[PDB]
Design a protein around this ligand. Structure first.
Ligand code: BCL
Ligand code: BCL
Ligand code: BCL
Ligand code: BCL
Ligand SMILES: CC[C@H]1c2cc3[nH]c4c(c3C)C(=O)[C@H](C(=O)OC)c4c3nc(cc4[nH]c(cc(n2)[C@@H]1C)c(C(C)=O)c4C)[C@@H](C)[C@@H]3CCC(=O)OC/C=C(/C)CCC[C@H](C)CCC[C@H](C)CCCC(C)C
Ligand SMILES: CC[C@H]1c2cc3[nH]c4c(c3C)C(=O)[C@H](C(=O)OC)c4c3nc(cc4[nH]c(cc(n2)[C@@H]1C)c(C(C)=O)c4C)[C@@H](C)[C@@H]3CCC(=O)OC/C=C(\C)CCC[C@H](C)CCC[C@H](C)CCCC(C)C
Ligand SMILES: CC(C)=CCC/C(C)=C\CC/C(C)=C/CC/C(C)=C/CC/C(C)=C/CC/C(C)=C/CC/C(C)=C\CC/C(C)=C/CC1=C(C)C(=O)c2ccccc2C1=O
Ligand SMILES: COC(C)(C)C/C=C/C(C)=C/C=C/C(C)=C/C=C/C(C)=C/C=C\C=C(C)\C=C\C=C(C)\C=C\C=C(C)\C=C\CC(C)(C)OC
Ligand code: HEC
Ligand code: HEC
Ligand SMILES: CCCCCCCCCCCCCCCCCC
Ligand SMILES: CCCCCCCCCCCCCCCCCC
Ligand SMILES: CCCCCCCCCCCCCCCCCC
Ligand SMILES: [Fe+3]
Ligand SMILES: [Mg+2]
Ligand SMILES: [Mg+2]
Ligand SMILES: [Mg+2]
Ligand SMILES: [Mg+2]
Lengths: 49, 53, 287, 273, 245, 342, 53, 53, 53
């Protein structure tokens, strides 16, 4: 409305936006799992020993 | 925002919102990568032993 | 072409559009390369940590080659080569920006006065970074690319050549900077005082003198015995601003090349004050 | 009635003391009560400077002439005329002459029916001189803290006061004042060049107006300050430069007594890190 | 030695003296440009033109005005309009006393210059200062108060009228004058007006109720010339000295 | 909403109360002393409360010394076995010196810090070997460097001040170098280092001047350049400047304490304290070259530096932030044994 | 964006988007190449031994 | 951009595109040449031994 | 640009292109001459031995 979009155009844009954001977040989660398997990043009580 | 909040794009202009989120995401990625490079254990290019102590 | 309420209070509110052109794009490319070099050397100097970068940003710099390299055209990178590259790219971007300003003046049918005022600052910048190191044969005599480091360079340059207060061209440049501030406060206050009479429309006052220009002239005539015109005060200000950097470049050219101690130069020429000897028996212990 | 348009402006009025006795001109200069006081203080001060010049035993040149303030041991008291009293009297006369110059400018503005922006801006320079020779000395408890009245010796005073803090470049108020002074020269060059380019477009070009002036800066930096905004900006820049100079000198000694570089430990060791 | 010409002279001293010559030449040139208006000078006692050397008065330069015409400086034109003010004895520097009303006559701070008798134009050739009621492409920023409708108070604490319109500079987007209908319509220069949006008033302390009734008016109600602008602004500026006193 | 005109007078009163806020916030103003000529502003700028606190600091209070035994009795070289440097002291004075040294170096750890707990004759700890060279160094400083340390003199308290590790010691690469790979060379500067007064000046200058004999004299002695004399040195000026920051911080003084800023080069315009500081530079270089550096093999890895070099002394090791160590308190008159080698 | 989202160019100007993408990609490539030059093992012009610790 | 995408010049102005490309290529060439000169093994004017270590 | 591509000057101003080319060529010649002067082997006015090491 204010931006100048119909509710149907907004729905399609949200569909593609949600798909893209879900793919991005899935890739980020996979990358964080890979980085944890490389080197865990929460230290214990002793540190990096 | 949620999977069902499709009307958020009736408030935010999609083109400008995507450029401000892309800019923010790139800057955040750069900051976190430099934070990893700035510490001995997570600098993958310096290649220190993982036990930096 | 967005608007700005806060900027519309001090002046106009419209920001844009900006014309870059060919020389503008070239200057941006050169300058971005220079800025990337400088900033990445700064970030690498704190071992890439952005926390330490935020802590130490004023102290960080890209540093010139040491004196052991002389005027080697391209020293090793981490020994001043990064500085030489950043200086080259910054100089190219600044020169392309000067050409851009000259061209913008030409395409608008306007005179090229801002371009030739920028040429004075470019001359000073070039003397500081390139011309004087070439004559002295050492890149090390050039300022670092840093916030606190170029202040350190300033202080150490004054100390090395014996109290740059005694450089007559430094005195002239200080006189011209003080005069730039003086003249610009004078002119701003004068135009604001005759703004009730249409004095801010100066170019219309130049080709058609109004009571604003007459009263502005008469205020200064009755104050200090002489005055300028609505256009001549701008020549006064332009020349005063140009002389700042012109005398700055001239006084930096002469430091180390023809004069090596400025205080002793003033002593030879009867300029340095002599003070009563409060410490009667102090001599050099190494003599 | 010297200029070709000055006769119609030379009328009575503008006096700050309410009287017609001093309302007259001598040549181009307007004489007021404050003009008379300005000349009184000026001739006293110049004659005392000449006296201190001829009484100097070292036979100084014009550059080496120096009338130094009293010793710090005299405090805020009175020194012998040859031991700082001359500097004190010249300081009093200089303050009086500068205030009288500002008030004479107020009188001229009132006569011309214009604003008092010029006396107000000159009051900032007067305040800088006062903060250097009267206020800061009283804050530090001695008139010997003022700078000597000499062309070259006041440079030595500046140098030694700066090196009393081991690196004066690291003073934050000094940084702000230097930034504003350099920006004032930048803005003055830009403004003078723009007005000269609009008034002197060249051969075959007509005199450009406000549209071209605004277009040149919107096309170069991306923003146009305007023709009224540029003069406000310039006055603000010069006044901010002098104000930050006053601040930096009032925090050096009265506030900061150690090296200036270590003041930035507030940022280096900010509680965040 | 390196930079020496003798046991006393050296390169820096010579470069300094060369800059002294250049600076003095620049100051001479600047002082020549200062004399493009108001010179040659005239005596304060009989108006006799004083002789100035051709080395102090520059040759006339021609300004090609944006809307046509050529202005030269110097131009040999001298302001010789009769000043309605007198003094006892033609002593040099003696100030003048207005014979009648200094505001209407234009004496002193009310004096104005005989500018062009044509309205100021823009680049495209349309009137620069016009009332807002005529132009639809120009409005007032909603962040700022609207002067229209505000009461107008003079320097004697008297409500002399209300603001009916605002005259805007079409070349700078700035309000130049306020059209005030006296409770018959006058233009108040905006720098001479102080706005109070809480009480909805505009204070013009430079005018009295008597002075507002004698403010010069433009020939046209949607068009003002540079000379009319100059006269009105000079009237309000002279009101700072001649109105409330 | 209507725009409210700014209350100029009310905000002027607020400005006055903010000036009061600034005055209470940022100073009772520093105390000045004048050392040179009027109008020059050569002198010291000190906060009175902070200067009084530094004088009343525990490190500046020289411990009380017991009455000295008459030096006429059995020497320590015959009563004791391993006393090569204190074999000329009477045994009573030897015990007095041991007690004083314990009070000066390791009061908390006691006699066992430098001695084997069950054998005072055994040179087992490295601390005893270091302390013997400490004694030799103190004797050498008192006998040979009276141009600087007299009449106050130096004892174990002058540097150590009641703890085994003196407060201001330095190593070669004391400030970690920045830069990864081919980027980021800090050149021994461009950091917030307290050696340079938290300036971006060379922070590793002590090696060039207090261990090496590099030139601190950058300012030429002639107004015009010579043919064989260098015409550059701005970066070399930064090294001298950083060294002068170290000197100023070690003595708690400003540049005007030893210099006239009109010319940092002219000794005739300098206070007589600059001559004492010259002898101090020579003495510190001698200390580091002759005593403190050759002790590196005697130190454990815990005591060495990032470069594996021995700890070294500077201007701040003795002065500890005062123009004179302990502000001029005499420390050698009570201990003539530490005043000269036997 | 995806191989099938051809309508993104009805919202983003192709010319300006291409220029911004080219600038960003060149800047990122320069950044990563400089970060490789700023590490001993991956500076290919300095040619340090691959094993750096 | 490929040999067959000739319609790019209906979207990008040939003159400004060529000038910007020339500027970018000159800056890139200068940067790479200076990077080579900034290393011991690739400064062909300094002529260090190739075996640099 | 090639020997037979004469329609350059229907897109590029011949005079402006010539002035820009002259400026670029003079600056590049100055740069390369400085490069030669800044290296010991190729500084022809300092006259060092060609064998430089
Ligand atoms: C390159 C070929 C196609 C393309 C084909 C696809 C396909 C197939 C997919 C995506 C998906 C995505 N695309 Mg895509 N995408 C294109 C151009 C772009 C551009 C752009 C402005 O150039 C951007 C910002 C994106 C961004 C994105 C992400 C928002 C999204 C998933 C994030 C991700 O993979 O993590 C990492 C992302 C980044 C680091 C940002 C860069 C994105 C890169 C350039 C896109 C290519 C990734 C794709 C998997 C590789 C296919 C190319 C093969 C070599 C043929 N695409 C072009 C037109 N894109 C995925 C998705 O939407 O999930 C449901 C998906 O499955
Ligand atoms: C990614 C797919 C969907 C999406 C799917 C969901 C779902 C499902 C949920 C949310 C919820 C939220 N989303 Mg969402 N969300 C989207 C895009 C966004 C964007 C954006 C500008 O892109 C923002 C700022 C947000 C912000 C938010 C939060 C304000 C809100 C609760 C905060 C939270 O749980 O984590 C704290 C915030 C952060 C850690 C940073 C925020 C940024 C990220 C993208 C948040 C996403 C978290 C969400 C769990 C992702 C799940 C997607 C997977 C496919 C499951 N979303 C897109 C459109 N979002 C939750 C909610 O409403 O509360 C009950 C919720 O259950
Ligand atoms: C050189 C002759 C043609 C040309 C012939 C081809 C051919 C054939 C192909 C491409 C392909 C590509 N071209 Mg092309 N291309 C041209 C001009 C350009 C310009 C330009 C503004 O000048 C740009 C930015 C590009 C960019 C691109 C990439 C987007 C794309 C593959 C990327 C890649 O290889 O990574 C490297 C890219 C870069 C480092 C930046 C681009 C720089 C150079 C000019 C890219 C050319 C790469 C190409 C493989 C070289 C082939 C030329 C030979 C003579 C055949 N081309 C000119 C008009 N180009 C490929 C493609 O799209 O397939 C999917 C492909 O097969
Ligand atoms: C010098 C005589 C002709 C000319 C004759 C030719 C011929 C023949 C050829 C080219 C080719 C090219 N020319 Mg041409 N070219 C001319 C002027 C120019 C100008 C200019 C603004 O002056 C530029 C930028 C170019 C640029 C180019 C390149 C884009 C292209 C590839 C060559 C190359 O190695 O790239 C690197 C470019 C540079 C380092 C800058 C270019 C500067 C010089 C002028 C390049 C000339 C190269 C060419 C071999 C000169 C030989 C002249 C002999 C007498 C035949 N030419 C003039 C008008 N040019 C070739 C081509 O299109 O490939 C299929 C080709 O076969
Ligand atoms: C009379 C002497 C005074 C003076 C004069 C002067 N300087 C001038 C001028 C004049 C008359 C100009 O016309 C010119 C100008 O434009 O000023 C606004 C300039 C100038 N004075 C400058 C600064 C300056 N002047 C100074 C001083 C002074 N200049 C003197 C006091 C100083 C000081 C005190 O040291 C400085 C720092 C510049 C603002 C400007 C010249 C600008 C220039 O050279 O630009 C090219 C250089 C670059 C590094 C390019 C920018 C690179 C960035 C990476 C850009 C961003 C790119 C990015 C792709 C953008 C988009 C990002 C997206 C995410 C949106
Ligand atoms: C506040 C912003 C800037 C500013 C503004 C400013 N100054 C102004 C004005 C304005 C707006 C005026 O209207 C007024 C004027 O008329 O200018 C032509 C003035 C003025 N600015 C002046 C100078 C000046 N302004 C300076 C600075 C600045 N002025 C600021 C940068 C400096 C500096 C930095 O050094 C100087 C020297 C004068 C030309 C003039 C004021 C003239 C005046 O006061 O006349 C009356 C006094 C005398 C004729 C002489 C009195 C002499 C004493 C009795 C004895 C001497 C005492 C003195 C301390 C000795 C100094 C010795 C050494 C330190 C040299
Ligand atoms: C009772 C009795 C004793 C009577 C005798 C009376 C006598 C003798 C005289 C009258 C009384 C008095 C007090 C006289 C003053 C005497 C003195 C000392 C005069 C000189 C004072 C003085 C400050 C002189 C100038 C000093 C200098 C060098 C100033 C710097 C100026 C400078 C850097 C550049 C000049 C640039 C000019 C001319 C700027 C003014 C100017 C500005 C700023 C505009 O903006 C403007 C806008 C539009 C049109 C015109 C102008 C314009 O003219
Ligand atoms: C990580 O970083 C990101 C990516 C986020 C980007 C951010 C960058 C940042 C934050 C950069 C900050 C930079 C700062 C703060 C810079 C400050 C610089 C200052 C204050 C400089 C002061 C003075 C410098 C001068 C005067 C330098 C002059 C140098 C000159 C003129 C050099 C000329 C050299 C030439 C012409 C070389 C030519 C090449 C030759 C001819 C030698 O080739 C043979
Ligand atoms: C390190 C700072 C020491 C402390 C703590 C104590 N002593 Fe000491 N002792 C030290 C040195 C360097 C020497 C050698 C003297 C020399 O001339 O080289 C000594 C020696 C002794 C001895 C002599 C033992 C022997 O030779 O057989 C004795 C008896 C002795 N010291 C006593 C002693 C006491 C009583 C202490 C506590 C007050 C004490 N030592 C502490 C260094 C150090
Ligand atoms: C006494 C403790 C001093 C303080 C305080 C400061 N300086 Fe120093 N300065 C001192 C000495 C003993 C010497 C001579 C050293 C030598 O090897 O001859 C110096 C010398 C300088 C110099 C160089 C003089 C020259 O001939 O070039 C400079 C530039 C210098 N001093 C600067 C300086 C600064 C900036 C100070 C405040 C931070 C400072 N000095 C204080 C002794 C003392
Ligand atoms: C004149 C007699 C010898 C000197 C005696 C001491 C003089 C200085 C101390 C008294 C005066 C200082 C305080 C003055 C305050 C003035 C406040 C306006
Ligand atoms: C701002 C002007 C001065 C305000 C009053 C200052 C009061 C303190 C003066 C102390 C003087 C004695 C101590 C220093 C010597
Ligand atoms: C002996 C030294 C003489 C120095 C004379 C300097 C004269 C400078 C004149 C500068 C202005 C020239 C005219 C510019 C008008 C505008 C052109 C577009
Ligand atoms: Fe102006
Ligand atoms: Mg010679
Ligand atoms: Mg280091
Ligand atoms: Mg260190
Ligand atoms: Mg102190």
């Amino acid at each position: 409305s204010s931006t100048g979009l119909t509710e149907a155009e907004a729905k399609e844009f949200h569909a593609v936006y949600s798909q893209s954001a879900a793919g991005f977040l899935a890739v980020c989660a996979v990358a964080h799992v890979l980085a944890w398997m490389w080197r865990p990043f929460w230290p214990g009580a002793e540190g990096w020993v | 925002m949620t999977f069902s909040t499709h009307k958020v794009w009736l408030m935010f202009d999609p083109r400008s919102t995507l450029v401000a989120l892309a800019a923010f995401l790139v800057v955040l990625a750069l900051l976190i990568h430099f934070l990893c490079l700035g510490h001995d254990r997570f600098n993958w290019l310096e290649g220190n032993p993982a036990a930096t102590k | 072409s967005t608007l700005s309420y806060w900027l519309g209070k001090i002046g106009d509110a419209q920001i844009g559009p900006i014309y870059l052109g060919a020389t503008g794009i070239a200057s941006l490319i050169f300058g971005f390369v220079a800025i990337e070099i400088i900033g990445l050397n700064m970030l690498a100097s704190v071992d890439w940590n952005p926390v330490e970068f935020l802590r130490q940003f004023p102290w960080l710099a890209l540093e010139p080659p040491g004196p052991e390299h002389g005027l080697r055209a391209m020293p090793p990178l981490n020994e001043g080569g990064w500085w030489v590259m950043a200086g080259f790219f910054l100089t190219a971007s600044i020169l392309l920006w000067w050409v851009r300003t000259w061209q913008r003046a030409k395409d608008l049918g306007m005179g090229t006065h801002i371009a030739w005022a920028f040429a004075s600052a470019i001359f000073f910048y070039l003397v500081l970074g390139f011309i004087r190191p070439v004559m002295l044969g050492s890149w090390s005599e050039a300022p670092p690319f840093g916030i606190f480091p170029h202040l350190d360079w300033t202080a150490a340059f004054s100390i090395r050549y014996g109290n740059l207060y005694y450089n007559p061209f430094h005195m002239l440049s200080i006189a011209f900077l003080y005069g730039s501030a003086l003249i610009f406060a004078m002119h701003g206050a004068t135009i604001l005082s005759v703004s009730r009479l249409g004095g801010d429309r100066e170019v219309e006052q130049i080709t058609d003198r109004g009571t604003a220009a007459e009263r502005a002239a008469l205020f200064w005539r009755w104050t200090m015995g002489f005055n300028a015109t609505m256009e001549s005060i701008h020549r006064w200000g332009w020349w005063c601003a140009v002389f700042v950097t012109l005398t700055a470049g001239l006084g930096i050219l002469l430091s180390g090349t023809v004069v090596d101690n400025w205080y002793l130069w003033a002593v030879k020429h009867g300029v340095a004050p002599t003070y009563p000897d409060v410490f009667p028996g102090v001599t050099d212990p190494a003599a | 009635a010297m200029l070709s348009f000055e006769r119609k402006y030379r009328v009575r009025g503008g006096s700050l003391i309410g009287g017609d006795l001093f309302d007259f001109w001598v040549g181009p200069f307007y004489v007021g009560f404050f003009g008379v006081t300005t000349l009184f203080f000026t001739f006293v001060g110049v004659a005392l400077i000449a006296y201190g010049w001829v009484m100097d035993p070292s036979d100084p040149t014009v550059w080496q002439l120096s009338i130094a303030p009293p010793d710090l041991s005299y405090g805020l008291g009175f020194a012998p005329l040859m031991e700082g009293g001359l500097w004190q009297i010249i300081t009093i006369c200089a303050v009086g002459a500068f205030v009288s110059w500002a008030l004479r400018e107020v009188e001229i503005c009132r006569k011309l029916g214009i604003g008092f922006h010029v006396p107000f801006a000159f009051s900032f320079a007067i305040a800088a001189y006062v903060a250097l020779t009267v206020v800061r000395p009283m804050l530090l408890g001695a008139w010997g803290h003022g700078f000597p009245y000499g062309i070259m010796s006041h440079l030595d005073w500046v140098s030694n006061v700066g090196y009393q803090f081991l690196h004066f470049h690291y003073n934050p108020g000094h940084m702000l004042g230097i930034t504003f002074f350099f920006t004032t020269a930048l803005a003055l060059a830009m403004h003078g060049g723009l007005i000269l380019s609009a008034a002197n477009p060249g051969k075959g070009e007509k005199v450009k107006g406000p549209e071209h002036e605004n277009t040149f800066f919107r096309d170069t930096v991306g923003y146009s300050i305007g023709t009224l905004g540029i003069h406000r900006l310039g006055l603000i820049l010069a006044l901010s430069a002098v104000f930050w100079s006053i601040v930096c000198m009032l925090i050096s000694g009265p506030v900061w007594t150690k090296g200036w570089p270590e003041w930035w430990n507030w940022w280096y060791e900010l509680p965040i890190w | 030695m390196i930079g020496d010409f003798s046991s006393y002279m050296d390169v820096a001293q010579i470069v300094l003296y060369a800059f002294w010559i250049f600076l003095f030449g620049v100051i001479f040139y600047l002082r020549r440009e200062d004399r493009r208006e108001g010179y040659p000078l005239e005596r304060d006692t009989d108006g006799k033109i004083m002789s100035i050397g051709p080395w102090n008065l520059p040759a006339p330069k021609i300004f090609y005005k944006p809307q046509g015409g050529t202005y030269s400086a110097p131009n040999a034109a001298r302001d010789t309009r009769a000043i309605k003010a007198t003094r006892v004895g033609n002593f040099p520097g003696a100030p003048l006393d207005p014979t009648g009303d200094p505001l209407v006559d234009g004496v002193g701070p009310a004096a104005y210059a005989e500018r062009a008798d044509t309205p100021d134009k823009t680049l495209e050739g349309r009137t620069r200062i016009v009332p807002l009621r005529t132009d639809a492409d120009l409005w007032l920023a909603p962040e700022d108060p609207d002067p229209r409708g505000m009461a107008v108070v003079a320097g004697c604490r008297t409500t002399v009228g209300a603001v009916s319109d605002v005259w805007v500079d079409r070349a700078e987007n700035i309000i130049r004058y306020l059209e005030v209908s006296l409770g018959k319509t006058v233009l108040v220069p905006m720098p001479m007006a102080v706005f109070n949006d809480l009480t909805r008033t505009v204070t013009v302390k430079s005018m009295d109720a008597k002075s507002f009734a004698n403010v010069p008016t433009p020939k046209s109600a949607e068009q003002i010339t540079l000379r009319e602008e100059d006269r009105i602004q000079a009237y309000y500026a002279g009101g700072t000295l001649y109105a409330n006193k | 909403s209507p725009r409210a005109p700014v209350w100029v007078g009310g905000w002027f009163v607020v400005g006055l109360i903010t000036i009061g806020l600034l005055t209470v916030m940022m100073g009772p103003a520093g105390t000045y002393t004048q050392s040179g000529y009027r109008g020059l502003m050569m002198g010291e700028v000190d906060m009175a409360d902070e200067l009084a606190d530094d004088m009343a600091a525990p490190k500046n209070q020289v411990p009380a010394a017991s009455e000295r035994f008459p030096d006429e009795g059995p020497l320590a070289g015959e009563v004791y076995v391993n006393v090569p440097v204190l074999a000329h002291l009477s045994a009573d004075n030897f015990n007095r010196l041991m007690v004083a040294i314990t009070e000066w170096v390791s009061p908390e750890e006691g006699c066992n810090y430098c001695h084997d707990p069950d054998d005072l004759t055994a040179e087992r700890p490295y601390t005893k070997i270091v302390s013997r060279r400490m004694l030799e160094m103190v004797m050498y400083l008192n006998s040979q460097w009276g141009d600087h340390v007299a009449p106050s003199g130096v004892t174990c308290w002058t540097c150590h001040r009641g703890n085994p590790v003196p407060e201001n010691i330095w190593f070669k690469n004391d400030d970690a170098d920045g830069g990864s790979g081919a980027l980021g060379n800090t050149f021994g500067q461009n950091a917030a280092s307290w050696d340079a007064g938290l300036s971006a000046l060379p922070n590793d200058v002590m090696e060039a001047y207090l261990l090496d004999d590099q030139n601190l004299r950058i300012t030429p002695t002639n107004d015009l350049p010579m043919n064989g004399v260098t015409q550059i040195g701005t970066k070399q000026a930064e090294w001298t400047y950083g060294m002068m920051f170290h000197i100023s911080k070690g003595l708690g003084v400003n540049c005007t304490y030893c210099h006239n800023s009109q010319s940092f080069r002219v000794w005739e315009m300098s206070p007589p304290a600059r001559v004492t500081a010259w002898h101090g530079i020579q003495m510190t270089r001698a200390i580091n070259v002759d005593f403190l550096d050759p002790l590196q093999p005697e130190y454990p890895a815990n005591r060495l530096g990032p470069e594996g070099d021995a700890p070294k002394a500077n201007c701040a090791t003795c002065h500890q932030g005062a123009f004179k160590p302990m502000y001029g308190e005499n420390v050698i008159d009570d201990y003539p044994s530490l005043a000269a080698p036997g």
